[PDB]
């Protein structure tokens, strides 16, 4: 079986970058809409006996992109692909991972069930909002981390990184920032709201680096940055793997004191970058390409958790 | 267990009509979108031990509405509803019911699988594009027919119906028109394309009635009507259960010779009716309400196949 | 169908308390071991058509108790019980809810799969370590909260509760303490380790109340209490729903400065209470009995999230 | 894919013997207990794309060992092993293979379901108590026989084997003894209880050889041996594949007239052999190693039913 | 059949509290007066096949409220309710339960007859003046007791309750006070008039607690309290289930030495509480709600005689 990479319509540039890193052309697929807006999918080449990877991020018109992904998986499965892998850099509905007191769906579990029944044998994703989502599946799920690329960016872009501070915006994700601070051998200052915020960790005259899994409306990072600037930090950075930037996010970032808002390209960023000068993108296509290549070859994927390829 | 009717966002007016016919209020549900356009669903009342019916048609923004339906089903299922029934008047992706020579998905089967894995115990739908779709499910599927309401409309609106002709637009659905002609005791003239059309059945100086399951772009019925008017039919009617009317449909209908284009309200029609004077709507809410009531009470549903309630 | 309550061997006293609150006798069941230590289960009365609840906590000899629960569920299912519900006050393997970087099982998901394949139609549990565990199931899961009973205990046992502080021991569970502080209208001081601990929130001359989901080795609460006593708190309390108290826990509690270590009786506590004078137990049998009664009667279970019955 | 052999904690020596016969080292795995006695499993090497065999017998602390096996299977499955095979020399709960008049579990079926849902693609076992247990699975099950090794032992250890008699202790397993007697070309004397026993087949002045699948409490073989010695047999042997020897078994064997009690090493025997001089062990590690090697290479496994490798 | 709760005009707040505890909305009913002051009742929703509970206490304008209750029962009965239950917390005309030497009506029996002929299938009431009134009916009557709530109030509000004394004001109801004293394990001092009063039971330097079924004009409790204060009781409390407080009652209570006059809310008390600072109310809505719920579900009501829900 050979690797076949197919792109959904959500993130074409990322799929092309992945395909170039693998020395492959993107598989021929027609992904459009019928007149009544139903998804139309046509696999333009035989996938019989091949190892198929479908790249689609949970961004943009999320329900359309998710339907397209499921329809593509189904088409490849009934076309006798030997294995079908969904490469989902940003997992849709990941924030609906529990009920907790409300008569609400667990939408992430529903998405996992739909991916399974569509025929996915394997999932590759990056920085799941909650790693318990891996347990929503019965098929293997490789949850990659942007952390090696983030560490590389910090070392090559922040001159005072040895004295900086790594700040979690909410108490929930402070595990990520502790791992990053341990890797950099720095202090991890913490922030949480009580309309007021409380911060532990000396930030005065230092650089503070907010790290989080995603920025949707940027309410979380803007409040944290306001707090940090209250406590005398010389500069504040925000680093996120998923740059969703919906709603009022671009205006809030423009009016905030961030030196830089760095995101990975798990979601296309060109349109947002046009309207916001302080957004910078870390390419993670090498990590995804290496994960695809290693799953195909039976090589260790977890080696990527700590190594930039 | 009591009947609880919940409406999705696709067809609120139909759900309200159904609820009024059952003497019930619509269940409290919040169905909206998060900032990043992910579906947000919140069941506003306990459904524990209840017989839940969720009304959502495959129309409008089809992928959003389908996701909303699946999320609502999941929310009701994990909220310990005794039974969950999807009331889907127009089944989405019904026209993708086979591959036939192409490397294509069977999207209708995927939709059936998704509805099943979401937790639906029962499906109620109207005039499935292909009744083989019933076999795509392992749960019971009640496929209702608009034919009794169509016959009622014909008898009360076409003065010359005893001399009229019932015409199938494509060879595929001529079964429907034969059933209708047998019920009315009239001739069924047939039409199919060879850019030219061929018609069997005397239509001269008579009324011809085109009957079909749906009109999407109205290419099918406009070509058939052109043929019929070539052969001297005094008036031509089109009657359809599903009035999708996407793309150039309204302009084609406006420029065509139809005396009337009658559709059921399985899909909301007010916006289309604003731009097209010859569209008339048959209310089928009584049929759906009776089907819901009979499934709840253990009464015969097939009795509705031949009786207007 | 009538309610039948069966007790596993793990927590007989809790099952008896539940049965008394429901006005029922415990169902006749023989639960012992064969000579080779395989679990032997014999249902001593017909359960045909009945609503069966099996009470077994994930405590003591956890693997034996889990096997016993699964075997009992299987016996009741193939004996034609109308419905089988596992009442698992402390869910076993709940702390193995993710992999996160290691080549490890997701044991909680395996347990959920085993409960499902054994035939459980419904799960009732209390204060799941991670509420995402609800998504590990496809059957409904009612995750009850000890919080109403905890609030009652605080109001009836701590004279200065209006001035007290609610302290989370680890950053992970601070959601619980924020909910409790909001209910009591008090400040929530927070603690996390950097062998040193950092605390936010005035605790001087006040009572601090540590709240957490469980105390296993009591390393978490003893370190937090040491920190709190460093910052001048007059008294320190610990309140937990699950009192596992394994390993060196009793000695650490005896040598710590806790005014009281309060636990619910989701796990039997008499043996631990013999060796530790500062352990007090909150009975939660009324909450479990009400949940059983409400699921049986189709009444709202979520009403218990905020109301002491 | 390469063979990877992992040992559970139940029978380490057997797993090592199997690994040596295959020219392999045992895979790195940490199998221990958390403080609260929950099983902790950590796969110490990548198994991605490998053919994994996990060796665990249903002996000792049976519920702990079964849980450990299931957790290991789950860990290997979600670590993207190409295939996972449970090598279970003595199948746990095999004697609970039916209900028969009692409101009892079919525990063997539950165990099969649990192994399947954990992710096992294949089962290798030896001398199932009832071969109908193979039908409890939907995955392939290779049920190996100790009979070739038993025949070899008889020919090399009993000088009068050409004149001996092969005796079934209970009527249920006389099929095994008929096969053995046919292979040796000897008479098969039979025994069954009516507190008295009845025997057919001349045993006077001869050697009698009791053959059975397992000896748990040794009540079965001791009663049969008492009967045989009543009828003048010069010596009595017992041969069993599974030497469970629980409860009073060692004392009964010590006080019985057996010349030898021979068991295979499907269960570790060193501790029992310390307290009982007449227990001898047949190594079956070559049979298990050959079965593993042949399943891996696509070679005939049934060839082992009649051939000692 | 579902529970439907309807409120009469007498005690709306109590009915609302009951409905909230049951998770229900009050049934739609118009209860007003025509111009000529005849009661007008209009049931605003179908009660066909439902289990109807009508809440109306014998207080305020007693004859109007009784007529309203009877008219509501009649309306629900001829509207084909499956069952109609009168929830009458304070039974009107209960003190006219006998003739005894006078040419007088037995008005309580007349009220029972009227309730029966109106169509009531069941009566729920609290602390009937004479429990023989239960025999005035041929339908079942559940006579609830305020005693559990009274005991709870005593334990949570009187610091010296272990040394207190429970005093009956008249010889007639001393049964209630003996039951209460037995529950509290205290002495029951007794009082009766000879314009002078005689008291048995040491009350000196102690708290005395008068307990009675009702306080109408408060002549009974004020005389008893005067006696108790003559004999040196440090404080005197009065506790009553029915706080009628008609005529000069408020002035007598204001001029009496009561530390507190505690009543249940079987009768609305806000207006009386405005004019009398020492009146406190025990909510008994949980007891009534539990009785309604248990009668509906076929659960034991007598369990409430000794248990606070
Ligand atoms: N796409 C979405 N956009 C915004 N909010 C969402 C979205 N999906 C779910 N939510 C809601 O957001 C909330 C989850 O918030 P969040 O993940 O930030 O915190 P948490 O899960 O409570 O805690 P933490 O992640 O810190 O452990 C829920 O109320 C959920 O319903
Ligand atoms: N939503 C859609 N809008 C338009 N075309 C669609 C849609 N879904 C599927 N199709 C395509 O339409 C075609 C199916 O057409 P149609 O159902 O009219 O005819 P058929 O199935 O070939 O025959 P018949 O229904 O007469 O037996 C397929 O090529 C299918 O891919
Ligand atoms: N029974 C157990 N006893 C002790 N440790 C366990 C047990 N089961 C799992 N663990 C281990 O404990 C760790 C989980 O710890 P814990 O739940 O306290 O923190 P977390 O999940 O990392 O974060 P948090 O709960 O604060 O969000 C994992 O390494 C897991 O393997
Ligand atoms: N681990 C165990 N130890 C002892 N007895 C067990 C064990 N598991 C099950 N049993 C019980 O042992 C009995 C089964 O006995 P056994 O297998 O010897 O005979 P059988 O199945 O009735 O007949 P046969 O095997 O001769 O055809 C059942 O009553 C079963 O419940
Ligand atoms: N609503 C009322 N208000 C006042 N007095 C009433 C009322 N209804 C009846 N009565 C009268 O009150 C008397 C009953 O008094 P009460 O119940 O206190 O004592 P009893 O029945 O004689 O004895 P006991 O209740 O101590 O065994 C009768 O004379 C009766 O006519
Ligand atoms: O609230 P938003 O800023 O839109 O979303 C970003 C944050 O909200 C969620 O918890 C994410 O994990 C981030 O921490
Ligand atoms: O082609 P369109 O007019 O858009 O769609 C309407 C017809 O096309 C499909 O076969 C339907 O069943 C109808 O017969
Ligand atoms: O570490 P232990 O004290 O044994 O276990 C108790 C804590 O560890 C886990 O995170 C629990 O949720 C508690 O917060
Ligand atoms: O009764 P035990 O001696 O403990 O167990 C050994 C026998 O019991 C079972 O039938 C086995 O198959 C053996 O025949
Ligand atoms: O005389 P009132 O104080 O008005 O009425 C209260 C008492 O009178 C009746 O016997 C009641 O049962 C009470 O004991
Ligand atoms: Mg979250
Ligand atoms: Mg967050
Ligand atoms: Mg078709
Ligand atoms: Mg057609
Ligand atoms: Mg955890
Ligand atoms: Mg914790
Ligand atoms: Mg057997
Ligand atoms: Mg046997
Ligand atoms: Mg009286
Ligand atoms: Mg009295």
Curated annotation (Swiss-Prot), chains A, B, C, D, E:
Binding of Mg(2+), residues: 127, 129, 138, 142
Keyword annotations: ATP-binding, Charcot-Marie-Tooth disease, Deafness, Disease variant, Gout, Intellectual disability, Kinase, Magnesium, Metal-binding, Neurodegeneration, Neuropathy, Non-syndromic deafness, Nucleotide biosynthesis, Nucleotide-binding, Retinitis pigmentosa, Transferase
Mutagenesis or variant effect for residue 145 to M: Reduces catalytic activity
Tagged with keyword GTP-binding: no
Impact reported for residue 131 to F: No effect on catalytic activity
Cofactors: Mg(2+)
Regulation: Activated by magnesium and inorganic phosphate. Inhibited by ADP and GDP.
GO biological process assignments: 5-phosphoribose 1-diphosphate biosynthetic process; hypoxanthine biosynthetic process; nervous system development; purine nucleobase metabolic process; purine nucleotide biosynthetic process; pyrimidine nucleotide biosynthetic process; ribonucleoside monophosphate biosynthetic process; urate biosynthetic process
Phenotypic consequence of residue 51 to H: In PRPS1 superactivity; no effect on Km; resistant to inhibition by ADP and GDP
Cited InterPro entries: PRib_PP_synth_CS, Pribosyltran_N, PRibTrfase_dom, PRTase-like, Rib-P_diPkinase, Rib-P_diPkinase_bac
Pfam families reported for this sequence: Pribosyl_synth (PF14572), Pribosyltran_N (PF13793)
Positions with a binding annotation for ATP: 95-100, 129
Pathway stated in the Swiss-Prot or TrEMBL entry: Metabolic intermediate biosynthesis; 5-phospho-alpha-D-ribose 1-diphosphate biosynthesis; 5-phospho-alpha-D-ribose 1-diphosphate from D-ribose 5-phosphate (route I): step 1/1
UniProt GO molecular function: ATP binding; identical protein binding; kinase activity; magnesium ion binding; protein homodimerization activity; ribose phosphate diphosphokinase activity
Effect of residue 128 to I: In PRPS1 superactivity; no effect on Km; resistant to inhibition by ADP and GDP
Annotated GO CC locations: cytoplasm; cytosol; ribose phosphate diphosphokinase complex
Pathology noted in the entry: Phosphoribosyl pyrophosphate synthetase I deficiency is a rare condition caused by mutations in PRPS1 that lead to variable disease phenotypes including optic atrophy, retinitis pigmentosa, ataxia, peripheral neuropathy and hearing loss.
Family listed: Belongs to the ribose-phosphate pyrophosphokinase family.
Subunit structure: Homodimer. The active form is probably a hexamer composed of 3 homodimers.
Name of the protein this chain belongs to: Ribose-phosphate pyrophosphokinase 1
Organism from which the protein derives: Homo sapiens
Gene: PRPS1
């Amino acid at each position: 079986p050979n690797i076949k990479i197919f792109s959904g319509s959500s993130h074409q540039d990322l799929s092309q970058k992945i395909a170039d890193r693998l020395g492959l052309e993107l598989g021929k697929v027609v992904t459009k809409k019928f007149s009544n807006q139903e998804t139309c999918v046509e696999i333009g080449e035989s996938v019989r006996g091949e190892d198929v990877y479908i790249v689609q991020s949970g961004c943009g018109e999320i329900n359309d992109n998710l339907m397209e992904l499921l329809i593509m998986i189904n088409a490849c499965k009934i076309a006798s692909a030997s294995r079908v892998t969904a490469v989902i850099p940003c997992f849709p509905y990941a924030r609906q991972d529990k009920k907790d007191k409300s008569r609400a769906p667990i939408s992430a579990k529903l998405v996992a069930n739909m991916l399974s029944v569509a025929g996915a044998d394997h999932i590759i994703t990056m920085d799941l909002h909650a790693s318990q989502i891996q347990g929503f599946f019965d098929i293997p799920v490789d949850n990659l981390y942007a952390e090696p690329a983030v560490l590389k960016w910090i070392r090559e872009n922040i001159s005072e990184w040895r004295n900086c501070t790594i700040v979690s915006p909410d108490a929930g994700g402070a595990k990520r920032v502790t791992s990053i601070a341990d890797r950099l051998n720095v202090d991890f200052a913490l922030i949480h709201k009580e309309d007021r915020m409380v911060l532990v960790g000396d930030v005065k005259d230092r650089v503070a680096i907010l790290v989080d899994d995603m920025a949707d409306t940027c309410g979380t990072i803007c409040h944290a940055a306001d707090k940090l600037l209250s406590a005398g930090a010389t500069r504040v950075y925000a680093i996120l793997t998923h740059g969703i930037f919906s709603g009022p996010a671009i205006s809030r970032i423009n009016n905030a004191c961030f030196e830089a808002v760095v995101v990975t390209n798990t979601i296309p960023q060109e349109d947002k970058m046009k309207h916001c000068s302080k957004i910078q993108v870390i390419d993670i296509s090498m990590i995804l390409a290496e994960a695809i290549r290693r799953t195909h070859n039976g090589e260790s994927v977890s080696y990527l958790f700590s190594h930039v390829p």
